[PDB]
From Swiss-Prot, chain B:
<comment type="similarity">
    <text>Belongs to the complex I 23 kDa subunit family.</text>
</comment>
<comment type="function">
    <text>Core subunit of the mitochondrial membrane respiratory chain NADH dehydrogenase (Complex I) which catalyzes electron transfer from NADH through the respiratory chain, using ubiquinone as an electron acceptor. Essential for the catalytic activity and assembly of complex I.</text>
</comment>
<comment type="subunit">
    <text>Core subunit of respiratory chain NADH dehydrogenase (Complex I) which is composed of 45 different subunits. This is a component of the iron-sulfur (IP) fragment of the enzyme. Interacts with RAB5IF.</text>
</comment>
<protein>
    <recommendedName>
        <fullName>NADH dehydrogenase [ubiquinone] iron-sulfur protein 8, mitochondrial</fullName>
    </recommendedName>
</protein>
Swiss-Prot record, chain D:
<keyword id="KW-0999">Mitochondrion inner membrane</keyword>
<keyword id="KW-0408">Iron</keyword>
<keyword id="KW-0472">Membrane</keyword>
<keyword id="KW-0496">Mitochondrion</keyword>
<feature type="modified residue" description="Hydroxyarginine">
    <location>
        <position position="54"/>
    </location>
</feature>
Curated annotation (Swiss-Prot), chain F:
<comment type="function">
    <text>Core subunit of the mitochondrial membrane respiratory chain NADH dehydrogenase (Complex I) which catalyzes electron transfer from NADH through the respiratory chain, using ubiquinone as an electron acceptor. Essential for the catalytic activity and assembly of complex I.</text>
</comment>
<keyword id="KW-1278">Translocase</keyword>
<comment type="similarity">
    <text>Belongs to the complex I subunit 6 family.</text>
</comment>
<dbReference type="GO" id="GO:0032981">
    <property type="term" value="P:mitochondrial respiratory chain complex I assembly"/>
</dbReference>
<keyword id="KW-0520">NAD</keyword>
UniProtKB/Swiss-Prot annotation, chain G:
<dbReference type="GO" id="GO:0005739">
    <property type="term" value="C:mitochondrion"/>
</dbReference>
<feature type="region of interest" description="Disordered">
    <location>
        <begin position="55"/>
        <end position="83"/>
    </location>
</feature>
<keyword id="KW-0496">Mitochondrion</keyword>
<keyword id="KW-0472">Membrane</keyword>
<keyword id="KW-0812">Transmembrane</keyword>
Length: 70, 70, 101, 156, 316, 168, 83
């Protein structure tokens, strides 16, 4: 019957879900649980590099809050 | 007796002419053809499960010659 | 560096499949087998090129709509597209878009 | 593990792939081509076995000769056979192709396609039923399943 | 971790292409009142694997090509570019977050014509060359409408960034304001990928260019061709059927976005089963006399419509 | 060795030019010009020009060069001089590369330097836009005269080519 | 009055695609002139602050230039919040 066509669709459907699911998880793993920063324009890049210097550890995604201010 | 297959005169009133403009621009009769193939997608296929099922035959079938005994 | 790795991986992968495709069956040993210019086609390519170039002048339109001279910008944007349509009309009427000899 | 065990299982993997994806090139010459179309029709649906309906000569694994092979046609048949990439099998369908059939004693008919190309399976009938050609195709699958190319190379 | 990311994109693409062959054979079967592969594995789930092994252990031809170096360059270029067109796709986060991603996909897509042209030369056959010339003229003709239609849509979006199309459709699909463009974009994607009713190459009784290829090299052209069918339908869904993105539950986006991308890929198989084939002179007239006049007119309309409603999108 | 990416690309740029400048068969000559075009875009991208670099792929490689190859396959009927020229070209490239990498200063018509292209890049930018994109978008606000003459020339190109190719 | 109707009703029957193309292109050239919202497009484009608003040295006679951003003097985007 027609529903015997679905199992092929499920495999094809799952294979198109892995690339999207993998990229989202790998970014969070590599960016300390946050989305990967988006820097399309020079101003955004300048802030990101500044965050690298302010973190102490040379990482753009380690955010320092008020507790870092005297 | 005989009949004509393709001897129609299409009307030239505005409503009829607009009907064929919608058909030309909005692809009405092409989508009418997609629906027919959609119906067959939900019909039970006519395939039999050979070699576990066999095609019907009749007592008059002519196959392998053979020699009989009394 | 990321975009460089992505291109390297895709084409490196394609090369591997190609060479192992021409050799894997050659690990097998099968017995050796032994033993007009068309003008209309050229005009399609040239018509595409001149149309393709005019598209190059239209790609920056989305950024061009951010200006403070919209009256001037909208006048030239419709001029380029109108001129592109004039070229199509000229070929159409001069039998350029035909495939019959 | 033994070498004779790995080769036995590798032979089963290549045989399984080859007999499960037979792509035929059909030489429809005469009435026997009609019965071959009924094997592709919904009743029997050769495609559900992996046997595609139509394949080009260079993408094909089996040649089905369905109809009468004439003397004016024989050179074309041999040329198509020589250009088939290997492995390649030939199925002879119908009395005309098997031995000439009703036109055996004609001046313009090759008496059997097996004197022009090698033949693996003969399907009798005039024409064979679409369920008789299908039985022949499944008999070619089992023949490919018995191949032992790797088990004979390992003993050379 | 980026290298792991690339492999998490490439392998699933090839697996999806492998099982698209099965799904195509079964959807076509049921629309024809039959079944399709259901013997090689349960419901034909092992049919793709059998076909792959068979092709890669079959002897290749490699005729007396005039070059023998274009014969090997053509499938590398086709498959290499086909995988490259996936790297900027937001699903919902791109592998490579390009600022001009929409323009990157046009650029890489216009290079796929060389593999069609080079394989024509390598075959060394005069007739095979004619088939390559007709295919090339088809591809370049229909990417004129891909470029202009895309420009018209981006005038309602404001950038060439692919992830900005997600923001643009945060209140409503672009299919609603731009359905006439969607129609001519959908048909233009069939012609680009040599799909029925535009498959003159595979349309025997008139010609294909990849006729001298067998075994593995043939499968490489096949894999690239089908990966482009999935990619173009993923592009269409992003462009005209935007899926809402929730930053806390990105998997929700991927499931909805995949379902749309599958439904549009099955529509390609649906259209193949329903219509006869265009003549070569007739698909050219469908572009130079019907689509192009409308595409140019709609481009004028979409340059002016945002201005006269005060609806110009932000640059950033 | 990643800091000298621009110079490495330029070296590949020249080698491609020596490829089709030696004039092998047109099929291979066009192949070498596609490689140089791709490398040429790579250089432009690393200087901050993204729209210009991509315009090379879409219009030059995917446009003109496709018409060149398309016309070659249909009107071209598919030696020591070629090899002699090709070997001569590479040697001059090697010596120019060798000297600019030894003393980092070469004088051939102009005074060239060998420190590295990175030393002349601007050190300050905090804009919320792409300076290259803003300039190209100015074609419609500032370049009114440019648009008219360019469009008219393209229109005349259509008229002229049909006149030339009619043959009667 | 009857000549135009006969002409229009014939292209609409034989060339519906071209009839649609010219109607759409014709609206792209006319409506912006008659549209009352075209003036708001320019104001929105002029209001977008890409650059820094460099301050002006105070001389004493500048009552129209605010001393602080939150003073009531200067251009106002109230019209934009309601558009
Ligand atoms: C990418 C996805 C696809 C991946 C492909 C996976 C394939 C997995 C199976 C690979 C191993 C089998 C490939 C070789 C089989 C060739 C064959 O059938 O003939 C045996 C061939 C036949 O050789 P032969 O010695 O018997 O005779 C050759 C000469 N003639 C025929 C003229 C007498 O023997 C081999 O070369 C096998 C080598 C060992 C394989 C390990
Ligand atoms: C290699 C095998 C053949 C590959 C053919 C395909 C070429 C890839 C296209 C070039 C990359 C690109 O398009 O950049 C767009 C994109 C445009 O992205 P963007 O404009 O959005 O900017 C990205 C960064 N922001 C947004 C922050 C400004 O380029 C990049 O993203 C990064 C640029 C990296 C530059 C390095 C290029 C080196 C490789 C070029 C040489 C290619 C040789 C080709 C050989 C001949 C074959 C044609
Ligand atoms: C005519 C033949 C060719 C036509 C091709 C038709 C196939 C293309 C798909 C058409 C149907 C649209 C997809 C419906 C299934 C999508 C499932 C889904 O994403 O969630 C339901 C989606 C959920 O919506 P959403 O997650 O996509 O977000 C909507 C975005 N906003 C909020 C801006 C509108 O809604 C539906 O599609 C219901 C129908
Ligand atoms: C207020 C301002 C409003 C401005 C905008 C107003 C717009 C008004 C409407 C304009 C018309 C709409 C354009 C429709 C496109 C017309 C293109 C055309 O050329 O038509 C004639 C063309 C050909 O017309 P023809 O062949 O009959 O004849 C042309 C004219 N003569 C007779 C002189 C030759 O039709 C086709 O395109 C053929 C279709 C090929 C087969 C396609 C299969 C269709 C499968 C269904 C797909 C459904 C779409 C899926 C979309 C999914 C998207 C996610
Ligand atoms: C079968 C009948 C219908 C026919 C087939 C239809 C097409 C196939 C279905 C569409 C494709 C979807 C393929 C993926 C489905 C299986 C995976 C799934 O359902 O979602 C799992 C997802 C994983 O969870 P995870 O991302 O790890 O969250 C961790 C948070 N700390 O959990 C989530 O987070 C989800 C939110
Ligand atoms: C509008 C709806 C009313 C209408 O169309 O007019 C109906 C009117 C009566 O019909 P009828 O008696 O047949 O008259 C035609 C005889 N010449 O018929 C008329 O006589 C009306 C006048 C006929 C001429 C009108 C031509 C209409 C086509 C012009 C192109 C319209 C383009 C619209 C945009 C298309 C894209 C969506
Ligand atoms: C409601 C009111 C709406 C406005 C009125 C409708 C517009 C009127 C014009 C429409 C009729 C056009 C004339 C025509 O009928 O052309 C038909 C002819 C087709 O000839 P052919 O296909 O070769 O014949 C084959 C026969 N076997 O074709 C020809 O001979 C020449 C056709 C050339 C078409 C050029 C297309 C390029 C223009 C695209 C539109 C872009 C907008 C143009 C700028 C508009 C500025 C305002
Ligand atoms: C600065 C350095 C410039 C000089 C570098 C010379 C590079 C060219 C190498 C010589 C060469 O090209 O081959 C010899 C030349 C043409 O090649 P040839 O073998 O004669 O081809 C026809 C033979 N029947 O034969 C010739 O006709 C001589 C051409 C001038 C050299
Ligand atoms: C620092 C400055 C950098 C300068 C770089 C310039 C050098 C780059 C070398 C690559 C350029 C190669 C140019 C191509 C030469 C060529 O095509 O010559 C073709 C000519 C025709 O020969 P043909 O008709 O094929 O039959 C054989 C007849 N003997 O065949 C011949 O006559 C052979 C001629 C030999 C070609 C090499 C000569 C180079 C001369 C350079 C002069 C400028 C310096
Ligand atoms: C190689 C041998 C060489 O150096 O020849 C240089 C010759 C004279 O140039 P000159 O500046 O006097 O030499 C520097 C000495 N300290 O000058 C030459 O022979 C160089 C030949 C160049 C031919 C120019 C052809 C027109 C193109 C001009 C564009 C600029 C190209 C030169 C600059 C790039 C260097 C290749
Ligand atoms: C101010 C800024 C804008 C300025 C724009 C000026 C440039 C316009 C560029 C347009 C693009 C070029 C197209 C020009 C070719 C026109 C078509 C043509 O070549 O004529 C061929 C046609 C052949 O005639 P035949 O086939 O024998 O018989 C049936 C004909 N209907 O002969 C014909 O009978 C065709 C009749 C002439 C076509 C007239 C087209 C007028 C289009 C304007 C419509 C605007 C309406 C907008 C309002 C819509 C409101 C809903
Ligand atoms: C027949 C040859 C024709 C000319 C091409 C030469 C190819 C072989 C290399 C010889 C010259 C040389 O010394 O190679 C070495 C150079 C290295 O340059 P760099 O990366 O800027 O090093 C400078 C940076 N340091 C200081 C870290 C070393 O290689 C190239 O630039 C690449 C050549 C293209 C391949
Ligand atoms: S064997 Fe019988 S059915 Fe087949 S071609 Fe001959 S006569 Fe016709």
């Amino acid at each position: 019957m027609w529903f015997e066509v679905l199992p092929g669709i499920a495999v094809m459907g799952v294979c198109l879900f892995i690339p999207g699911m993998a990229t989202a998880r790998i970014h969070r793993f590599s960016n300390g649980g946050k989305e990967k920063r988006v820097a399309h324009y020079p101003y955004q890049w300048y802030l990101m590099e500044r965050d690298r210097r302010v973190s102490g550890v040379n990482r753009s995604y380690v955010s320092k809050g008020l507790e870092n201010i005297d | 007796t005989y009949k004509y297959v393709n001897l129609r005169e299409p009307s030239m009133d505005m409503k009829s002419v607009t009907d064929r403009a919608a058909q030309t621009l909005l692809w009405t009769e092409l989508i009418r053809g997609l629906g027919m193939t959609l119906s067959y997608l939900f019909r039970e296929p006519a395939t039999i499960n050979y070699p576990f099922e066999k095609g019907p035959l009749s007592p008059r079938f002519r196959g392998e010659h053979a020699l009989r005994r009394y | 560096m990321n975009l460089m790795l992505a291109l390297l991986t895709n084409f490196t992968l394609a090369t591997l499949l190609v060479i192992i495709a021409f050799w894997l069956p050659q690990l097998n040993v099968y017995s050796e087998k032994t033993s007009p210019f068309s003008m209309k086609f050229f005009l399609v390519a040239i018509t595409f090129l001149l149309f393709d170039l005019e598209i190059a002048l239209l790609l920056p339109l989305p950024w061009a709509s951010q200006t403070a001279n919209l009256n001037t910008m909208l006048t030239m944007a419709l001029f380029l597209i109108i001129l592109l349509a004039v070229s199509l009309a000229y070929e159409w009427t001069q039998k350029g878009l035909e495939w019959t000899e | 593990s033994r070498g004779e065990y790995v080769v036995a299982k590798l032979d089963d993997l290549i045989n399984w792939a080859r007999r499960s994806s037979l792509w035929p090139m059909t030489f429809g010459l005469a009435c026997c081509a009609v019965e071959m179309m009924h094997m592709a029709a919904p009743r029997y649906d050769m495609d559900r076995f992996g046997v595609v309906f139509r394949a080009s000569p260079r993408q094909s694994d089996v040649m089905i000769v369905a109809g009468t092979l004439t003397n004016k046609m024989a050179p074309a048949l041999r040329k198509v056979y020589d250009q088939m990439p290997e492995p390649r099998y030939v199925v002879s369908m119908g009395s005309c192709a098997n031995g000439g059939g009703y036109y055996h004693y004609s001046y313009s008919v090759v008496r059997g396609c097996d004197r022009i190309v090698p033949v693996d399976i003969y399907v009798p009938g005039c024409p064979p039923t679409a369920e008789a050609l299908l039985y022949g195709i499944l008999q070619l699958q089992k023949k490919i399943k018995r191949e032992k190319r790797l088990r004979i190379w390992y003993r050379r | 971790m980026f290298m792991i990311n690339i492999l998490m994109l490439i392998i699933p693409i090839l697996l999806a292409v492998a099982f698209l062959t099965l799904v195509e054979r079964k959807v076509l079967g049921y629309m024809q009142l039959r079944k399709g592969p259901n013997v090689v594995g349960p419901y034909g789930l092992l049919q793709p694997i059998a076909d792959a092994i068979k092709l890669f252990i079959k002897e290749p031809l490699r005729p007396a090509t005039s070059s023998a170096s274009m014969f090997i360059l053509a499938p590398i270029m086709a498959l290499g570019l086909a995988l490259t067109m996936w790297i900027p796709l937001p699903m919902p986060y791109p592998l490579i977050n390009m600022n001009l991603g929409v323009l990157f996909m046009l650029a890489m897509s216009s290079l796929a014509v060389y593999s069609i042209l080079w394989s024509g030369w390598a075959s060394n056959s005069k007739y095979a060359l004619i088939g390559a010339l007709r295919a090339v003229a088809q591809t370049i003709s229909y990417e004129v409408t891909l470029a202009i239609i895309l420009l018209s849509v981006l005038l309602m979006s404001g950038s060439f960034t692919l992830s900005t199309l997600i923001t643009t459709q945060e209140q409503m699909w672009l299919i609603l304001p731009a359905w006439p463009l969607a129609m001519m974009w959908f048909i233009s994607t069939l012609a680009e990928t040599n799909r029925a009713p535009f498959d003159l190459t595979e349309g025997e009784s008139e010609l294909g260019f990849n006729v001298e290829y067998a075994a593995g090299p043939f499968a490489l052209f096949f894999m690239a061709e089908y990966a482009n069918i999935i990619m173009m339908n993923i592009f269409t869904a992003i462009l005209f059927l935007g899926t809402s993105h929730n930053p806390h539950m990105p998997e929700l986006y991927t499931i909805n976005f995949t379902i749309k991308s599958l439904l549009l890929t099955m529509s390609f198989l649906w259209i193949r089963a329903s219509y006869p084939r265009f003549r070569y002179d007739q698909l050219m007239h469908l572009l130079w006399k019907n689509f192009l006049p409308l595409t140019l007119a709609l481009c004028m309309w979409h340059v002016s419509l945002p201005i006269l409603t005060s609806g110009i999108p932000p640059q950033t | 060795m990643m800091l000298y990416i621009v110079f490495i690309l330029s070296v590949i740029f020249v080698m491609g030019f020596v490829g089709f400048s030696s004039k092998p068969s047109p099929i291979y000559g066009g192949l070498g010009l596609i490689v140089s075009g791709g490398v040429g875009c790579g250089i432009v991208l690393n200087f901050g020009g993204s729209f210009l670099g991509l315009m090379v792929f879409l219009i030059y490689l995917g446009g003109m060069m496709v018409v060149f190859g398309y016309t070659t396959a249909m009107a071209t009927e598919q030696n020591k001089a070629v090899l002699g020229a090709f070997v001569t070209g590479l040697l001059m490239e090697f010596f120019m590369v060798y000297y600019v990498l030894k003393d980092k200063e070469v004088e051939v018509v102009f005074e060239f330097n060998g420190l590295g292209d990175w030393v002349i890049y601007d050190t300050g930018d905090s804009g919320f836009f792409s300076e290259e994109a803003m300039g190209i978008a100015a074609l419609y606000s500032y370049g009114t005269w440019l648009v008219i003459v360019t469009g008219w020339s393209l229109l005349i190109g259509v008229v002229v080519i049909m006149e030339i190719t009619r043959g009667n | 009055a009857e000549r135009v109707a006969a002409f229009l009703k014939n292209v609409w029957a034989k060339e519906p695609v071209l009839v649609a193309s010219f109607a759409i292109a014709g609206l792209a050239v006319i409506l912006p002139t008659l549209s009352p919202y075209t003036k708001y497009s320019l104001m929105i484009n002029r209001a977008t602050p890409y650059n820094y608003p460099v301050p002006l040295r105070d001389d004493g006679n500048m009552p129209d230039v605010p001393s602080h951003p939150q003073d009531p003097q200067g251009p106002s985007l109230e019209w934009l919040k309601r558009l």
